[PDB]
Amino acid sequence: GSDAIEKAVSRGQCLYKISSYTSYPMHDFYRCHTCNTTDRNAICVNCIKKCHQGHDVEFIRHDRFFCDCGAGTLSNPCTLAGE
């Protein structure tokens, strides 16, 4: 496919800013067990490194997802969405 997702990741931004909740772009996604209000959350790599620094996190797989951190559905607010 195109490099558009990889480029967005390289810019350091959250992938929700290009996926919203209506598309499922393909990239690496992670899970945060510390912020588990939603049970099987999927979090983009920039959010896991910044919004979940020091949290209990795991890489899950490279597959289609939209970022639950940027969507605003986790216990904590996304630090890549406007602070």
- Contact of 4 with 40, CB cutoff 8 Å: no
Which residues contact residue 66 at a Cβ distance below 8 angstroms, ignoring those fewer than 6 apart? Answer: 15, 16, 19, 20, 21, 23, 24, 25, 42
* Ranges within 8-47 binding Zn ion (CB under 5 A): 14, 32, 34-35, 44, 47
Cβ nearer to Zn ion, comparing 8 with 14: 14
> Considering the complex, what minimum distance in angstroms separates the CB of residue 32 from Zn ion?
3
Distances (CA, A) of 33 to 15, 18, 27, 42: 20, 25, 20, 11
The size of the interface with Zn ion (CB under 5 A), counted in residues, is 14
| Residue list for the binding site for Zn(2+) | 14, 32, 35, 44, 47, 51-52, 55, 67, 69, 78
**What residues line the site for Zn ion (CB under 5 A)?**
14, 32, 34-35, 44, 47, 51-52, 55, 67, 69-70, 78, 80
